[PDB]
């Protein structure tokens, strides 16, 4: 059924599963026309498809050309997402295909179920979690490759960098969701925290800085403080 606080450890068992987030597939800027009307200009987007156990991220870049001449773009975006996820699954060897796909927004369920009719044994699930994957475009190198794309392009990363060498996938996912929640609530502060100490660098193929275990605890502490503070500045407590 739906994924929630109660069945959270299932994410880290040995059944292959993917989270799919479509929040950054169809992206626009809204602007005024010369006549004083409002129009949108699309910008490149991405599907965020993540194995939470391994950290493998399948980042399908959605180039603005896929919207040309199309109507009802927000609805098409859900079907385009579903088409691309279905294509990804079919491209994987059978032993690599997921047993479950968890969508972060319930409106993806019917589009994905229809595109996956050929895979009756893959369960399509919603979640009750309010996961912060929309903030993936606050990760500088992910945002960079999406904005630079001139054609449709599948891009990869281990969103956990090398963390699994030292921590479990439960702990890696918790760190990730805390980082992303922070970036979503106050990107400027969050990025200030992550980069304040010039001596800690980001390896060329890593998305995050090379913190020691001790430095990660300090970092994670600062990210919590931010999330509670912003919640302070928002609600006045």
């Amino acid at each position: 059924g739906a994924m929630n606080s109660s069945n959270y450890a299932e994410l880290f068992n040995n059944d292959i599963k993917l989270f799919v987030d479509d929040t950054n597939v169809y992206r626009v800027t809204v602007h005024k026309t010369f006549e004083g009307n409002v129009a949108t200009k699309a910008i490149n987007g991405c599907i965020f498809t993540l194995n939470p156990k391994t950290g493998h991220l399948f980042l399908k870049i959605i180039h603005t050309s896929v919207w040309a001449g199309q109507k009802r773009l927000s609805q098409l975006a859900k079907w385009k997402t579903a088409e691309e996820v279905s294509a990804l699954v079919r491209s994987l060897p059978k032993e690599e295909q997921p047993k479950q796909i968890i969508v972060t927004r319930k409106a993806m369920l019917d589009p994905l179920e229809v595109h996956m009719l050929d895979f009756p044994n893959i369960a399509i699930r919603p979640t009750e979690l309010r996961l912060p994957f929309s903030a993936a475009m606050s990760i500088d190198k992910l945002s960079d490759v999406v904005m630079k794309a001139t054609e449709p392009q599948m891009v990869l990363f281990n969103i956990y960098d090398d963390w699994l060498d030292r921590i479990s996938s439960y702990t890696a996912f918790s760190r990730l969701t805390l980082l992303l929640r922070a970036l979503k609530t106050n990107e400027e502060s969050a990025k200030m925290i992550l980069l304040s100490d010039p001596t800690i660098t980001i390896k060329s193929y890593h998305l995050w800085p090379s913190f020691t275990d001790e430095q990660w605890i300090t970092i994670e502490s600062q990210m919590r403080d931010l999330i509670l503070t912003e919640y302070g500045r928002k609600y006045n407590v």
């Binding site: 098409l76 079907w79 019917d110 589009p111 009719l117 050929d118």
Partner: protein, 300 residues
């Protein structure tokens, strides 16, 4: 005008014939129903006084044989049977009519209700949905499940309605996933009408039979079938104009005939609001929309 005699009425029972009903006391002399209009299917149905559980009944067409009802005290129900001896049958009927122990099918002359509810319903199609080939009439009851219901347990006793499933490979062409899910015209016109039903008359016949089994027996899977066949049409952008006009008439009379106090259970909020207000055909069901609004404005 044809007749279905009853050997006796040994247990208290509400007897229905089409949209009519007669309430009978234990061993009260209800010996038959006479003056049944020829040219239509009919349904005789029963609800025992002592156990309103299980409405059940028989679909039949008097052109196909001489039929009668006889209570079976072992199986505990009124059973339809065929009398093959024509002289025995006419003699039985004439005696019962002389004692005036047969009620007259109480059709008002102006009244086309039954015709309008059974316009496309044929016995031959009924007998393929209800498989029991040794009989010319078809038994249905409240509890019988449909083929599609059994997929999600006794096959011989199933309602073999045409399986409609909007998230199935039959419904969705590879490469037209979004197109076919949001506009079911391919599924309606090519898969179902051209492929399976052959024409819209057979489609409407099954839709009307599903409704009638839902209404007369509270058969839940029949109600699901009726709503699914409505939804398939309303969710299709391209429907022949004659089918839409006829659908509006069909549904109008079904909504007109529905008991007011059974609307809560027999009408699916989501299908009706979608068909009347959101779907492609939102503007094509004027009669049905007007009666729905004036009779069930709560559902909407």
């Amino acid at each position: 005008m044809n007749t279905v005699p009853f050997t006796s009425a040994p247990i208290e029972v509400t007897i229905g014939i089409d949209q009519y009903s007669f309430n009978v006391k234990e061993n009260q002399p209800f010996h038959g129903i006479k003056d049944i209009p020829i040219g239509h299917v009919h349904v005789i149905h029963f609800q025992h006084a002592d156990n309103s559980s299980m409405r059940y009944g028989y679909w039949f067409d008097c052109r196909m044989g001489n039929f009668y009802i006889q209570y079976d005290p072992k199986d505990g129900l009124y059973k339809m049977m065929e009398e093959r001896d024509g002289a025995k049958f006419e003699n039985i009927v004439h005696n019962f009519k002389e004692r005036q122990m047969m009620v007259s099918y109480p059709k008002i002359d102006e009244d086309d209700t039954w015709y309008n509810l059974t316009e496309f319903v044929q016995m031959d199609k009924i007998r393929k949905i209800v498989r029991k080939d040794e009989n010319q009439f078809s038994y249905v009851d409240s509890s019988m499940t449909t083929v599609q219901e059994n997929e999600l347990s006794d096959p011989a006793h199933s309602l073999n309605y045409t399986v409609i499933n909007f998230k199935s490979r039959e419904a969705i062409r590879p490469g037209h996933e979004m197109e076919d899910f949001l506009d079911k015209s391919y599924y309606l016109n090519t898969v179902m009408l051209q492929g399976i039903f052959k024409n819209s008359s057979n489609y409407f016949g099954e839709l009307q039979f599903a409704f009638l089994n839902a209404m007369f027996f509270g058969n839940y899977g029949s109600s699901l079938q009726w709503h699914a066949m409505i939804e398939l049409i309303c969710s299709s952008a391209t429907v022949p104009k004659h089918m839409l006009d006829k659908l509006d008439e069909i549904l109008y009379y079904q909504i007109k005939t529905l008991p007011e106090q059974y609307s809560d259970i027999l009408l699916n909020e989501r299908v009706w609001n979608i068909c009347l207000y959101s779907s492609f055909q939102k503007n094509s069901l004027h009669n049905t929309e007007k009666i729905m609004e004036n009779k069930y404005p709560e559902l909407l």
